Amino acid sequence: AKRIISKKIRVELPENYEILIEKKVVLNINTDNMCNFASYRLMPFSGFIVEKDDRIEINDKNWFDMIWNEEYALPDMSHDKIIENIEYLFNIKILSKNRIKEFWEEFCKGQ
Amino acid sequence: TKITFYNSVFIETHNGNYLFSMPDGNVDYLILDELIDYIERLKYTPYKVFLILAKRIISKKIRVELPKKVVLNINDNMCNFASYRLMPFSGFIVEKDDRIEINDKNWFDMIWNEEYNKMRSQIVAEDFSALPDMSHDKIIENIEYLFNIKILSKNRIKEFWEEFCKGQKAAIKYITQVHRKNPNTGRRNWNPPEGDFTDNEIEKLYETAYNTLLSLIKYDKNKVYNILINFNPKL
Amino acid sequence: KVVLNINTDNMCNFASYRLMPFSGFIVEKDDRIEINDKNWFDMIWNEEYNKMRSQPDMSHDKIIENIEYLFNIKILSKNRIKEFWEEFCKGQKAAIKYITQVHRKNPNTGRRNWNPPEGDFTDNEIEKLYETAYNTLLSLIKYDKNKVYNILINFNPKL
Amino acid sequence: VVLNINTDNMCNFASYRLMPFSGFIVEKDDRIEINDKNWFDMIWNEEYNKMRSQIALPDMSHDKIIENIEYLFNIKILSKNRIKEFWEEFCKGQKAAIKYITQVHRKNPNTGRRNWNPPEGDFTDNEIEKLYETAYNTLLSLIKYDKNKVYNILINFNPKL
Amino acid sequence: MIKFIGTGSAFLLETGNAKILIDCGIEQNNEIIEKKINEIGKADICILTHAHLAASGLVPLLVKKRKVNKIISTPATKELCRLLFNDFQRIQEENNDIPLYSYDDIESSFEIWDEIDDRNTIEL
Amino acid sequence: AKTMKKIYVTMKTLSPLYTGEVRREDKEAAQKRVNFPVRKTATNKVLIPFKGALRSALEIMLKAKGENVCDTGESRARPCGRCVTCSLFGSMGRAGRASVDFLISNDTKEQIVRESTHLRIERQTKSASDTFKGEEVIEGATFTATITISNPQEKDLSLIQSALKFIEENGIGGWLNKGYGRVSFEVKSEDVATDRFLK
Amino acid sequence: AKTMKKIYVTMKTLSPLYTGEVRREDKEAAQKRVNFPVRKTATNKVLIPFKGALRSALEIMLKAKGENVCDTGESRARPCGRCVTCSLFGSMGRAGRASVDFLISNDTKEQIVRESTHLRIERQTKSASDTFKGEEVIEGATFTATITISNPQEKDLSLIQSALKFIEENGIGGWLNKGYGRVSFEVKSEDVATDRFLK
Amino acid sequence: AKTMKKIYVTMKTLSPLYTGEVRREDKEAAQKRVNFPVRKTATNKVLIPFKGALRSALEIMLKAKGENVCDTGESRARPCGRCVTCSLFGSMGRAGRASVDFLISNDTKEQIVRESTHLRIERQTKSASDTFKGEEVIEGATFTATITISNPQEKDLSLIQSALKFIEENGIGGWLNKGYGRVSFEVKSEDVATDRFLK
RNA sequence: CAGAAGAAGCGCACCUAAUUUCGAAUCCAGCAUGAGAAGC
Ligand SMILES: [Zn+2]
Ligand SMILES: [Zn+2]
Ligand SMILES: [Zn+2]
Ligand SMILES: [Zn+2]
């Protein structure tokens, strides 16, 4: 604790017991031209939502534009090769619906 | 709100020890080369500094921010592209009385189906635009008997009148729908007769209700209203 | 020809077009395929529905005692005497019809359209007071107009 | 003004001919066009394709369609649940309706079973299979017709769908 | 907000819509452990860092008292904890002290047990 | 009259909730699709009447305690004007001192209203004899109200909280005998000055 | 009046239990994954209807005794308003004196609801012709309800207890003849005051 | 009606028994222990389907006898509603008079369930080609189920005992062809008044 | 810095997870009070 307070870092020991951080979502799109269709005040909008540290910011194409001008193991087989191989092994009954089910189950846990 | 002045206003609330521009206490928000040491002099390095300078102070391991209803996103697979984490999403912002929801195309498709079902089921053919025969007394007799036993009720007479205002054809549609014996359940939409009976008798009173209401649609509106107003005084 | 009677003010701009979802009624004419809103059809539904629908004996000294009692235990009121006097001025028949309407006990609920007596009355004394109101007002039916007005004017001074 | 809606399904309310509708007033260069939901689905695919980029149905006549749907409704193949779920997939787009009728008609390669409801009554196996193919062809022909006429065809067999 | 319960150690992080738990475990009195377990309340998730009994030992006790809906951990931490919980129950029963949970609590704890790897973002 | 008691009331549903639609046009339009519509605002929010529930609660509780409380509720009954319920809720003379707002949701019908299937089952055959659909409000739905007592007496918040416990125990509205309407209340009582707005 | 009976009813589930989802949105959401969803609250607890089971129980037993009871199981059958079942659970004239709550589980759906595979076997080839998935409540899961009887009478707890025994024998919920829904009921009754909340 | 036939059936296994687990979570929890888990309750007791073997037994023998009977084993079949098996066990609208409880054991899994090594042997090398581990219920295990028949008829006990003789000679559960499932049923039937719980 | 108790191998696969009926009926929609006062 003494060494990390020496690194200017606040530390709360468990023999003791405060700011309110709150991540917010910013529209950043102008909600003037807005109608009511089915008793809901709605607007179809095209945008590029961004997740910034501490803030989710919905952002119009103006955003992508500015950021566009600013900016600008496992083996390998083609997509059609994968579909053709799983098609053949499905009709040769090596790959089954249960094997594909558990491969999807383990792939949903990570790679 | 404990406020202290320095050569700097050090307001110390319970929501953070704010300081607009170095005290010896813990400082949470710094509302701010010469600039870097001032932050280095503060013990318990601040959570956020509200300011080229930002690039450097980010690399000094410090958070920055550079200067209504709650907005809730309902749409979530993003991508690294152009540095910032990001996704393409087209959607709909909706402005509720206490919130702003960010919905997608499935919500609008849902409310499109929910509105289209309301739209398509409001006008039913010739609204406000081969019937059997019965004497007026026989109509009075059968509607009175089927009002005493609970087949032709006040709600049935009311809903007869509302559809018969919308034309003869809508009234025939309503009467055919009420008399319809569903082949999967063997049941008509007539309210069942009160009093001890038998299924042949009950089916014949249902048939009597069908023929007496159908023989009333051929009559004039005023004559229909003056037959039914003796039973349901509203309509 | 096409006329848009729907208000064109509020319109979003998605996909570089000014689009707006509407839910209305496309309506035919001699040459006008007009798009008329929800309110227009509430106009024509109300218009068409409204168009298709629009097309005994007792003593006077005992009568005074009865209307006093029934005005003091609140069965007979200023409003009852008012509508009784209007129906009396529209005829004998309609006033008997109104007295019948008020006294009519609905078989489904067993409720008459009088005002309930206040006080610790049980069931059949309230029923006897309702019958008393029936026979008192229906005995007042046969009397001449001047006598009914002088009888009612003690209780409801407006009528 | 340029209506992009077929002006059919028009009832006669009193001395008035009209059509319940929901669409979009897409005000453009001088058109102020009235385009339906299919245009909005195209527009949504336009946007949700363009924005990402920065990172043969048979003809069967209408009266034969009512005749076949009626025959299949009385022999318990096109039940009210089938008409309801077909309507829910039809309002979700025609492609989802192709997917649903393909899924229900697909004779599973292992079991040999289709997902229709079995015919009630005496029918041979070849006859039952021809009835299942009739169900596929009739609903696949119903996918082409527009939303209003499909609602009129399906409302006479399922009153709540 | 975060509560530091710790006998047993645990980290309850009440978000405001859930009660997420970190490392319910006991390295070493059974009654005060049970009272301290009752002090946590119904938790939506019980996240396990590692498969040591200092951070996983009380997980079957939490499914005895039905205080956890899902026990997420790493796929190797789970398999480890199979052997770990049967060994802890073998030692506890073998010592003739009254078992703090049972083998059925072990089984049912692995009935609601999900498993994710590193760098896999769950949203619950 | 210098003070005003504001009781902010926050009601969370511990059960399905139903309160029927009273508006004839809205009821008919919804009865084309669901036989028992729930009461709804035009802003698509759920509205329970709250003054009658509180008044009925206080009338049965205060009649049980043996107090001088009349029975509004009997057919065309006249409030006496001398009870505590006539003081807090009104008589034919003076109005009620407590303005009881409707219990309006913070959520919209898409989020809290579900159409549910209810049955009548024949006893001997044990099969469905009747079927109907009813709109209900989900569990955990949060509703708000603000009771505003003008000329506040000292036993006014206690009676409101007692009525809130009675509404918790009997249910707020709708099919209360079937299990619907079981709720819980949170009471943010306060005492504001009447000249709060005059700056 | 002046007292209210409170029957605190605790179910322990002995066989598995199924009561299907009634809400159209929740059912249509779950029929993608499971062909027989279970009734579930929005706070993820299991919901069993209890008033109809207690009604139906008492109607069968009192019709078998010969005591006069109406039938409210027949299609659109008007309640009589004179029988003891009409006094306890309700008629069209007078409401039910017994306010039966919903049987709500003490535990969450991810702790007592399991998804199960059911079949139809061809009687001749002894081979699966149909496979469906259904959600069931596990055995030993505990449900709670309060039967809150206003205007108490003497035979209103015992008949309820009698009806509970019938629900112990026949079952509650669905799939009652395949063995689903055999349960045990434990009862704790108390005559709470009607003015208990008045502080 | 006025009576109800309660048939208490005690079944003793005369060979190993396998009824496979239907719950998803119980199978996925046991997939690293036993490849064929036994259907057990959450009270750790073995749960066997009983309605469905009785129906299949009665349908096969009544089809063999030539008496009119439908097949509720063919895929998505509709029970006719007229045959006797539709009376006892049910149809789509009339429901089963014979409420057939699950065969819950009298003991726990630790006493009756054992984990076993089953094999597939090559016919030309006489070698263990596949080894797979499955649970089974031991011999002598006792299971109990109560069949409660409402509206009792004359040929309802006799048909159920005939069906139980069919399950005695054919088997209950899975792996019936290998020798698994051979049992002995013992029946004690009694007619109870439907108003027996009133007191 | 946390648990620990005659050989050998194996302890895995596959299918199915759908279908259908019902979604109505009924009662109620009243009553009461106040119709004045004051300035220019
Ligand atoms: Zn460790
Ligand atoms: Zn009073
Ligand atoms: Zn009755
Ligand atoms: Zn049959």
Coordinates of C-alpha atoms in Angstrom, one line a residue, chain G residues 13-16 58 60-66 113-118 120-124 126-127 129-130 133 136-140 155 158-159 162 165-166 169-170 176-180 182, chain H residues 1-2 4 6 22-27 39 41-43 47 51-52 55-56 59-60 63 71-77 89 95-96 98-102 104 148 150 192 194-199:
Chain G
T13 CA -43.3 -30.0 -6.2
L14 CA -43.3 -33.8 -6.0
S15 CA -43.5 -34.9 -9.6
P16 CA -42.4 -32.4 -12.3
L58 CA -64.5 -27.7 -4.9
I60 CA -66.2 -31.6 -8.5
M61 CA -66.2 -32.6 -4.8
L62 CA -69.4 -30.7 -3.9
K63 CA -71.2 -32.0 -7.0
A64 CA -70.1 -35.5 -6.0
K65 CA -71.4 -34.9 -2.4
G66 CA -74.8 -33.8 -3.8
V113 CA -37.0 -24.8 -14.8
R114 CA -35.4 -27.4 -17.1
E115 CA -35.8 -28.0 -20.8
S116 CA -36.8 -31.6 -21.5
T117 CA -37.1 -33.9 -24.6
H118 CA -40.4 -35.7 -25.0
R120 CA -44.0 -40.0 -29.6
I121 CA -42.9 -43.6 -30.3
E122 CA -44.5 -45.6 -33.2
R123 CA -46.2 -48.5 -31.4
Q124 CA -45.1 -51.0 -34.0
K126 CA -40.9 -48.9 -31.5
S127 CA -39.2 -45.8 -33.0
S129 CA -42.1 -40.5 -34.7
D130 CA -42.2 -37.1 -32.9
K133 CA -39.2 -29.9 -26.1
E136 CA -40.8 -28.3 -16.7
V137 CA -40.5 -27.3 -13.0
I138 CA -38.1 -29.6 -11.1
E139 CA -39.1 -31.7 -8.2
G140 CA -38.7 -30.1 -4.8
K155 CA -66.2 -23.7 6.6
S158 CA -61.5 -26.5 5.6
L159 CA -62.9 -26.6 2.1
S162 CA -60.1 -30.1 1.2
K165 CA -56.0 -32.4 -0.9
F166 CA -57.8 -32.8 -4.3
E169 CA -54.3 -36.1 -5.7
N170 CA -55.2 -35.0 -9.2
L176 CA -51.9 -34.0 -15.4
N177 CA -52.5 -37.5 -16.8
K178 CA -49.0 -38.0 -17.9
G179 CA -47.9 -37.7 -14.3
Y180 CA -47.0 -34.0 -14.2
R182 CA -48.2 -34.0 -8.3
Chain H
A1 CA -68.8 -38.9 -11.4
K2 CA -69.4 -40.0 -7.8
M4 CA -62.9 -42.6 -8.7
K6 CA -57.4 -45.5 -7.5
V22 CA -34.7 -35.9 -20.8
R23 CA -33.5 -32.8 -19.1
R24 CA -30.9 -30.9 -21.2
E25 CA -28.9 -29.6 -18.2
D26 CA -28.7 -33.0 -16.5
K27 CA -27.5 -34.6 -19.7
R39 CA -33.9 -40.0 -15.9
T41 CA -35.9 -36.3 -10.3
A42 CA -34.3 -33.3 -8.7
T43 CA -35.1 -35.1 -5.4
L47 CA -38.6 -41.0 -12.9
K51 CA -48.6 -43.0 -19.5
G52 CA -47.4 -43.8 -23.0
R55 CA -51.3 -46.5 -24.1
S56 CA -48.9 -48.2 -26.5
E59 CA -53.2 -49.9 -28.6
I60 CA -51.2 -52.9 -29.8
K63 CA -55.4 -53.5 -32.7
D71 CA -52.8 -45.1 -33.4
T72 CA -51.4 -42.3 -31.3
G73 CA -47.9 -43.4 -32.2
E74 CA -47.8 -42.4 -35.8
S75 CA -46.4 -39.0 -36.5
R76 CA -48.5 -36.0 -35.5
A77 CA -51.5 -38.3 -35.1
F89 CA -55.8 -42.0 -22.0
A95 CA -58.8 -35.8 -22.2
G96 CA -57.7 -38.9 -20.3
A98 CA -56.8 -42.4 -16.4
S99 CA -54.5 -39.9 -14.8
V100 CA -51.3 -41.9 -14.8
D101 CA -48.7 -40.8 -12.4
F102 CA -45.0 -41.2 -13.2
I104 CA -41.1 -42.5 -9.0
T148 CA -56.5 -42.3 -10.8
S150 CA -62.3 -40.4 -13.2
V192 CA -62.7 -43.9 -3.6
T194 CA -64.8 -38.2 -5.2
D195 CA -66.1 -36.3 -2.1
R196 CA -63.8 -38.2 0.2
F197 CA -61.7 -35.1 1.0
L198 CA -64.7 -33.0 2.2
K199 CA -64.9 -32.9 6.0

